[PDB]
Amino acid sequence: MNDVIGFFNEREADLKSQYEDKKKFVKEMRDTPEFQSWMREIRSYDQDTKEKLNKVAEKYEEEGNFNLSFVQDVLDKLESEIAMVNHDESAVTILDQVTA
Amino acid sequence: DPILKRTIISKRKAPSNNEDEEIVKTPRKLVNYVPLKIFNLGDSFDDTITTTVAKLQDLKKEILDSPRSN
Amino acid sequence: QRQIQNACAFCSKERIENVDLPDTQEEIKRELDKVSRMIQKAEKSLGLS
Amino acid sequence: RELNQTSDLNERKMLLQAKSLWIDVAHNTDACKNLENEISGIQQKVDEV
Amino acid sequence: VESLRDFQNKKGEIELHSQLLPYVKVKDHKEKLNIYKEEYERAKANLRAI
Protein backbone atom coordinates (compact mmCIF):
# COMPACT_ATOMS: atom_id res chain seq x y z
CA MET A 1 0.00 0.00 0.00
CA ASN A 2 2.89 2.41 0.56
CA ASP A 3 3.91 1.81 -3.06
CA VAL A 4 0.36 2.27 -4.33
CA ILE A 5 -0.20 5.45 -2.29
CA GLY A 6 3.06 6.92 -3.60
CA PHE A 7 1.91 6.00 -7.10
CA PHE A 8 -1.47 7.67 -6.54
CA ASN A 9 0.27 10.75 -5.14
CA GLU A 10 2.38 11.06 -8.29
CA ARG A 11 -0.72 10.40 -10.44
CA GLU A 12 -2.66 13.17 -8.69
CA ALA A 13 0.36 15.47 -9.06
CA ASP A 14 0.29 14.78 -12.80
CA LEU A 15 -3.46 15.45 -12.83
CA LYS A 16 -2.85 18.73 -10.99
CA SER A 17 -0.24 19.70 -13.59
CA GLN A 18 -2.66 18.87 -16.42
CA TYR A 19 -5.38 20.92 -14.72
CA GLU A 20 -2.97 23.85 -14.42
CA ASP A 21 -2.14 23.50 -18.12
CA LYS A 22 -5.86 23.54 -18.96
CA LYS A 23 -6.32 26.65 -16.81
CA LYS A 24 -3.44 28.30 -18.69
CA PHE A 25 -5.07 27.34 -21.99
CA VAL A 26 -8.36 28.86 -20.83
CA LYS A 27 -6.59 32.05 -19.77
CA GLU A 28 -4.76 32.38 -23.09
CA MET A 29 -8.00 31.63 -24.95
CA ARG A 30 -9.24 34.99 -23.68
CA ASP A 31 -7.43 38.34 -23.90
CA THR A 32 -6.09 37.27 -27.30
CA PRO A 33 -4.63 39.71 -29.84
CA GLU A 34 -7.77 38.96 -31.85
CA PHE A 35 -9.81 39.86 -28.77
CA GLN A 36 -7.82 43.10 -28.83
CA SER A 37 -8.76 43.52 -32.50
CA TRP A 38 -12.36 43.33 -31.29
CA MET A 39 -14.20 46.19 -29.52
CA ARG A 40 -12.86 48.54 -32.23
CA GLU A 41 -14.59 46.72 -35.06
CA ILE A 42 -17.68 47.48 -32.97
CA ARG A 43 -16.55 51.12 -32.87
CA SER A 44 -16.10 51.14 -36.65
CA TYR A 45 -19.63 49.79 -37.07
CA ASP A 46 -20.89 52.38 -34.56
CA GLN A 47 -19.43 55.14 -36.74
CA ASP A 48 -22.03 54.06 -39.33
CA THR A 49 -25.09 52.84 -37.43
CA LYS A 50 -27.74 50.60 -39.06
CA GLU A 51 -29.75 51.95 -42.04
CA LYS A 52 -28.24 50.53 -45.27
CA LEU A 53 -25.66 48.56 -43.28
CA ASN A 54 -28.44 46.90 -41.28
CA LYS A 55 -30.22 45.90 -44.50
CA VAL A 56 -27.09 44.49 -46.15
CA ALA A 57 -26.23 42.69 -42.90
CA GLU A 58 -29.70 41.12 -42.88
CA LYS A 59 -29.16 40.03 -46.48
CA TYR A 60 -25.75 38.60 -45.54
CA GLU A 61 -27.34 36.70 -42.65
CA GLU A 62 -29.97 35.29 -45.00
CA GLU A 63 -27.24 34.21 -47.43
CA GLY A 64 -25.20 32.63 -44.65
CA ASN A 65 -28.04 30.64 -43.11
CA PHE A 66 -29.25 29.62 -46.58
CA ASN A 67 -25.72 28.46 -47.43
CA LEU A 68 -25.67 26.45 -44.16
CA SER A 69 -22.04 27.50 -43.69
CA PHE A 70 -20.10 30.27 -41.96
CA VAL A 71 -16.40 29.64 -42.69
CA GLN A 72 -16.10 27.68 -45.93
CA ASP A 73 -18.88 29.73 -47.53
CA VAL A 74 -17.28 33.04 -46.51
CA LEU A 75 -13.83 32.00 -47.73
CA ASP A 76 -15.29 30.69 -51.00
CA LYS A 77 -17.18 33.93 -51.60
CA LEU A 78 -14.05 35.96 -50.81
CA GLU A 79 -12.00 33.90 -53.27
CA SER A 80 -14.70 34.18 -55.95
CA GLU A 81 -14.99 37.96 -55.58
CA ILE A 82 -11.20 38.37 -55.62
CA ALA A 83 -10.98 36.29 -58.80
CA MET A 84 -13.79 38.41 -60.27
CA VAL A 85 -12.10 41.72 -59.41
CA ASN A 86 -8.78 40.43 -60.78
CA HIS A 87 -10.11 41.16 -64.29
CA ASP A 88 -11.41 44.70 -63.76
CA GLU A 89 -10.97 48.20 -65.20
CA SER A 90 -10.52 47.19 -68.84
CA ALA A 91 -10.36 50.35 -70.99
CA VAL A 92 -12.28 52.21 -68.27
CA THR A 93 -10.22 55.39 -68.70
CA ILE A 94 -12.48 56.61 -71.52
CA LEU A 95 -16.28 56.29 -71.64
CA ASP A 96 -17.57 59.64 -72.91
CA GLN A 97 -15.50 60.94 -75.83
CA VAL A 98 -15.98 57.62 -77.64
CA THR A 99 -19.74 58.18 -77.43
CA ALA A 100 -19.34 61.80 -78.57
CA ASP B 1 -30.24 46.40 -29.08
CA PRO B 2 -29.73 45.15 -32.71
CA ILE B 3 -30.77 41.52 -33.38
CA LEU B 4 -27.63 41.37 -35.55
CA LYS B 5 -25.09 41.31 -32.71
CA ARG B 6 -26.99 38.68 -30.72
CA THR B 7 -27.51 36.46 -33.77
CA ILE B 8 -23.85 36.76 -34.77
CA ILE B 9 -22.68 36.08 -31.22
CA SER B 10 -22.86 32.53 -29.86
CA LYS B 11 -24.56 31.81 -26.55
CA ARG B 12 -22.25 30.13 -24.05
CA LYS B 13 -24.94 27.74 -22.75
CA ALA B 14 -25.99 26.67 -26.26
CA PRO B 15 -23.64 23.63 -26.41
CA SER B 16 -24.95 20.53 -24.64
CA ASN B 17 -22.21 20.54 -21.98
CA ASN B 18 -19.73 19.41 -24.68
CA GLU B 19 -19.55 15.87 -23.34
CA ASP B 20 -16.27 14.14 -24.18
CA GLU B 21 -15.70 10.65 -25.56
CA GLU B 22 -16.94 7.77 -23.36
CA ILE B 23 -16.21 8.35 -19.66
CA VAL B 24 -12.42 8.83 -19.72
CA LYS B 25 -9.64 9.41 -22.24
CA THR B 26 -9.43 6.77 -24.95
CA PRO B 27 -6.68 4.14 -24.52
CA ARG B 28 -3.52 4.76 -26.52
CA LYS B 29 -0.50 2.64 -27.40
CA LEU B 30 2.64 3.28 -25.37
CA VAL B 31 4.37 4.69 -28.48
CA ASN B 32 1.68 5.18 -31.15
CA TYR B 33 3.78 7.62 -33.16
CA VAL B 34 2.32 7.22 -36.67
CA PRO B 35 4.19 10.16 -38.27
CA LEU B 36 2.43 10.19 -41.67
CA LYS B 37 2.08 13.93 -42.45
CA ILE B 38 3.03 13.31 -46.09
CA PHE B 39 1.09 16.42 -47.15
CA ASN B 40 0.71 19.55 -45.01
CA LEU B 41 -2.13 21.63 -46.50
CA GLY B 42 -1.49 22.97 -50.01
CA ASP B 43 -2.29 20.10 -52.40
CA SER B 44 -4.76 21.37 -55.08
CA PHE B 45 -2.48 22.40 -57.95
CA ASP B 46 0.02 19.72 -58.93
CA ASP B 47 3.72 20.52 -59.10
CA THR B 48 4.78 18.26 -62.00
CA ILE B 49 2.53 19.93 -64.59
CA THR B 50 3.80 23.39 -63.68
CA THR B 51 7.31 21.90 -63.60
CA THR B 52 6.90 20.97 -67.25
CA VAL B 53 5.49 24.48 -67.71
CA ALA B 54 8.62 26.06 -66.19
CA LYS B 55 10.87 23.82 -68.28
CA LEU B 56 8.99 24.96 -71.38
CA GLN B 57 9.37 28.54 -70.14
CA ASP B 58 13.16 28.34 -69.98
CA LEU B 59 13.19 26.47 -73.30
CA LYS B 60 11.14 29.20 -75.00
CA LYS B 61 13.40 31.84 -73.45
CA GLU B 62 16.39 30.02 -74.96
CA ILE B 63 14.52 30.00 -78.28
CA LEU B 64 13.95 33.76 -77.88
CA ASP B 65 17.72 34.05 -77.56
CA SER B 66 18.05 32.41 -80.98
CA PRO B 67 17.38 34.76 -83.93
CA ARG B 68 13.81 35.07 -85.21
CA SER B 69 12.75 36.57 -88.56
CA ASN B 70 15.00 38.81 -90.73
CA GLN C 1 14.10 11.93 -49.04
CA ARG C 2 11.09 11.56 -51.34
CA GLN C 3 10.11 15.16 -50.55
CA ILE C 4 13.64 16.48 -51.00
CA GLN C 5 13.98 14.57 -54.28
CA ASN C 6 10.75 16.20 -55.45
CA ALA C 7 12.14 19.59 -54.40
CA CYS C 8 15.41 18.97 -56.26
CA ALA C 9 13.34 17.91 -59.26
CA PHE C 10 11.30 21.13 -58.97
CA CYS C 11 14.29 23.45 -59.51
CA SER C 12 16.22 23.11 -56.21
CA LYS C 13 15.54 22.99 -52.48
CA GLU C 14 18.64 24.97 -51.50
CA ARG C 15 17.63 27.97 -53.64
CA ILE C 16 14.39 28.16 -51.65
CA GLU C 17 15.53 29.30 -48.18
CA ASN C 18 16.69 32.69 -49.51
CA VAL C 19 13.16 33.57 -50.69
CA ASP C 20 10.90 35.06 -48.01
CA LEU C 21 7.36 33.78 -47.36
CA PRO C 22 5.28 33.29 -44.19
CA ASP C 23 5.79 29.87 -42.61
CA THR C 24 2.08 29.32 -41.92
CA GLN C 25 0.72 26.61 -44.21
CA GLU C 26 -2.76 28.16 -44.39
CA GLU C 27 -1.38 31.44 -45.76
CA ILE C 28 0.68 29.56 -48.35
CA LYS C 29 -2.37 27.52 -49.38
CA ARG C 30 -4.37 30.74 -49.76
CA GLU C 31 -1.57 32.21 -51.87
CA LEU C 32 -1.49 29.06 -54.02
CA ASP C 33 -5.24 29.30 -54.56
CA LYS C 34 -4.87 33.00 -55.42
CA VAL C 35 -2.12 32.38 -57.97
CA SER C 36 -4.09 29.48 -59.45
CA ARG C 37 -7.11 31.76 -59.86
CA MET C 38 -5.06 34.52 -61.49
CA ILE C 39 -3.38 31.97 -63.79
CA GLN C 40 -6.87 30.82 -64.77
CA LYS C 41 -7.80 34.46 -65.43
CA ALA C 42 -4.73 34.93 -67.63
CA GLU C 43 -5.54 31.70 -69.49
CA LYS C 44 -9.15 32.72 -70.12
CA SER C 45 -7.97 36.15 -71.29
CA LEU C 46 -5.66 34.33 -73.71
CA GLY C 47 -8.36 31.72 -74.33
CA LEU C 48 -5.90 29.10 -75.56
CA SER C 49 -3.81 26.95 -73.22
CA ARG D 1 5.48 37.43 -75.67
CA GLU D 2 2.07 37.26 -74.02
CA LEU D 3 3.02 33.74 -72.92
CA ASN D 4 6.21 35.12 -71.36
CA GLN D 5 4.09 37.66 -69.50
CA THR D 6 1.86 34.84 -68.22
CA SER D 7 4.85 32.60 -67.46
CA ASP D 8 6.30 35.24 -65.15
CA LEU D 9 3.24 34.65 -62.97
CA ASN D 10 3.50 30.90 -63.61
CA GLU D 11 7.06 30.87 -62.25
CA ARG D 12 5.83 33.00 -59.34
CA LYS D 13 3.43 30.12 -58.65
CA MET D 14 6.52 27.91 -58.88
CA LEU D 15 8.18 30.03 -56.21
CA LEU D 16 5.13 29.77 -53.93
CA GLN D 17 4.61 26.01 -54.38
CA ALA D 18 8.33 25.32 -53.93
CA LYS D 19 8.29 27.36 -50.72
CA SER D 20 5.35 25.24 -49.57
CA LEU D 21 7.18 22.00 -50.40
CA TRP D 22 10.36 23.17 -48.65
CA ILE D 23 8.41 24.18 -45.53
CA ASP D 24 6.77 20.75 -45.57
CA VAL D 25 10.28 19.27 -45.76
CA ALA D 26 11.33 21.43 -42.81
CA HIS D 27 8.32 20.28 -40.78
CA ASN D 28 9.13 16.65 -41.57
CA THR D 29 12.77 17.16 -40.59
CA ASP D 30 11.97 18.84 -37.28
CA ALA D 31 9.41 16.15 -36.43
CA CYS D 32 12.08 13.56 -37.26
CA LYS D 33 14.46 15.40 -34.93
CA ASN D 34 11.82 15.33 -32.19
CA LEU D 35 11.39 11.59 -32.74
CA GLU D 36 15.17 11.20 -32.57
CA ASN D 37 15.24 13.06 -29.25
CA GLU D 38 12.40 10.89 -27.93
CA ILE D 39 14.13 7.66 -28.97
CA SER D 40 17.40 8.96 -27.50
CA GLY D 41 15.66 9.53 -24.17
CA ILE D 42 14.05 6.09 -24.35
CA GLN D 43 17.46 4.58 -25.14
CA GLN D 44 18.93 6.41 -22.14
CA LYS D 45 16.19 4.87 -19.99
CA VAL D 46 17.03 1.49 -21.54
CA ASP D 47 20.69 2.04 -20.64
CA GLU D 48 19.66 2.87 -17.08
CA VAL D 49 17.67 -0.37 -16.95
CA VAL E 1 -18.88 49.30 -65.90
CA GLU E 2 -20.54 46.12 -64.64
CA SER E 3 -17.19 44.87 -63.33
CA LEU E 4 -16.85 48.10 -61.34
CA ARG E 5 -20.38 47.61 -60.00
CA ASP E 6 -19.56 44.02 -59.02
CA PHE E 7 -16.35 45.25 -57.38
CA GLN E 8 -18.46 47.66 -55.34
CA ASN E 9 -20.67 44.72 -54.37
CA LYS E 10 -17.54 42.76 -53.41
CA LYS E 11 -16.24 45.60 -51.24
CA GLY E 12 -19.65 45.80 -49.57
CA GLU E 13 -19.51 42.06 -48.87
CA ILE E 14 -16.00 42.47 -47.45
CA GLU E 15 -17.14 45.34 -45.22
CA LEU E 16 -20.04 43.14 -44.08
CA HIS E 17 -17.66 40.87 -42.17
CA SER E 18 -15.03 43.60 -41.69
CA GLN E 19 -17.10 46.46 -40.26
CA LEU E 20 -18.65 44.07 -37.75
CA LEU E 21 -16.68 41.49 -35.78
CA PRO E 22 -15.08 38.77 -37.96
CA TYR E 23 -17.74 36.07 -38.06
CA VAL E 24 -15.31 33.22 -38.76
CA LYS E 25 -12.95 34.37 -36.01
CA VAL E 26 -15.69 35.00 -33.46
CA LYS E 27 -17.26 31.60 -34.12
CA ASP E 28 -13.89 29.85 -33.82
CA HIS E 29 -13.15 31.74 -30.59
CA LYS E 30 -16.53 30.76 -29.15
CA GLU E 31 -15.99 27.10 -30.06
CA LYS E 32 -12.49 26.98 -28.59
CA LEU E 33 -13.68 28.78 -25.45
CA ASN E 34 -16.48 26.23 -25.05
CA ILE E 35 -14.16 23.25 -25.45
CA TYR E 36 -11.56 24.75 -23.10
CA LYS E 37 -14.23 25.50 -20.49
CA GLU E 38 -15.62 21.96 -20.62
CA GLU E 39 -12.11 20.50 -20.40
CA TYR E 40 -11.40 22.73 -17.39
CA GLU E 41 -14.66 21.65 -15.75
CA ARG E 42 -13.99 17.93 -16.20
CA ALA E 43 -10.38 18.35 -15.04
CA LYS E 44 -11.42 20.18 -11.87
CA ALA E 45 -14.13 17.59 -11.19
CA ASN E 46 -11.56 14.80 -11.50
CA LEU E 47 -9.17 16.73 -9.26
CA ARG E 48 -11.84 17.16 -6.59
CA ALA E 49 -12.75 13.47 -6.83
CA ILE E 50 -9.15 12.29 -6.38
UniProtKB/Swiss-Prot annotation, chain B:
Entry-annotated residues carrying Phosphoserine: S16
Cellular compartments annotated: Nucleus; Cytoplasm
Subunit structure: Component of the Smc5-Smc6 complex which consists of KRE29, MMS21, NSE1, NSE3, NSE4, NSE5, SMC5 and SMC6. Interacts with NSE5.
Protein's job: Acts in a DNA repair pathway for removal of UV-induced DNA damage that is distinct from classical nucleotide excision repair and in repair of ionizing radiation damage. Functions in homologous recombination repair of DNA double strand breaks and in recovery of stalled replication forks.
Protein name: DNA repair protein KRE29
Species name: Saccharomyces cerevisiae (strain ATCC 204508 / S288c) (Baker's yeast)
Span of the entire protein shown here: 86 to 155 of 464
Swiss-Prot record, chain C:
Domain of life from the UniProt record: Eukaryota
Compartment(s) where it occurs, according to its Swiss-Prot or TrEMBL record: Nucleus; Chromosome
Signal sequence interval, chain numbering: none
Record remark: domains: The flexible hinge domain, which separates the large intramolecular coiled coil regions, allows the heterotypic interaction with the corresponding domain of SMC5, forming a V-shaped heterodimer.
Record function comment: Acts in a DNA repair pathway for removal of UV-induced DNA damage that is distinct from classical nucleotide excision repair and in repair of ionizing radiation damage. Functions in homologous recombination repair of DNA double strand breaks and in recovery of stalled replication forks. Probably plays a role in structure.
UniProt similarity note: Belongs to the SMC family. SMC6 subfamily.
Miscellaneous comment as given in the Swiss-Prot or TrEMBL entry: Present with 339 molecules/cell in log phase SD medium.
Complex and partners: Component of the Smc5-Smc6 complex which consists of KRE29, MMS21, NSE1, NSE3, NSE4, NSE5, SMC5 and SMC6.
Descriptive protein name: Structural maintenance of chromosomes protein 6
High-level lineage: Eukaryota, Fungi, Dikarya, Ascomycota, Saccharomycotina
From Swiss-Prot, chain E:
Source species, domain of life: Eukaryota
Subcellular localization, as worded in the UniProt entry: Nucleus; Chromosome
Post-translational modification: Sumoylated by MMS21.
Extra information: Present with 892 molecules/cell in log phase SD medium.
Family: Belongs to the SMC family. SMC5 subfamily.
Record note on quaternary structure: Component of the Smc5-Smc6 complex which consists of KRE29, MMS21, NSE1, NSE3, NSE4, NSE5, SMC5 and SMC6.
Record remark on domains: The flexible hinge domain, which separates the large intramolecular coiled coil regions, allows the heterotypic interaction with the corresponding domain of smc6, forming a V-shaped heterodimer.
Summary of the function given for this chain in its UniProt record: Acts in a DNA repair pathway for removal of UV-induced DNA damage that is distinct from classical nucleotide excision repair and in repair of ionizing radiation damage. Functions in homologous recombination repair of DNA double strand breaks and in recovery of stalled replication forks.
Protein name: Structural maintenance of chromosomes protein 5
Originating species: Saccharomyces cerevisiae (strain ATCC 204508 / S288c) (Baker's yeast)
Source lineage: Eukaryota, Fungi, Dikarya, Ascomycota, Saccharomycotina
Encoding gene, per UniProt annotation: SMC5
Span of the entire protein shown here: 250 to 299 of 1093
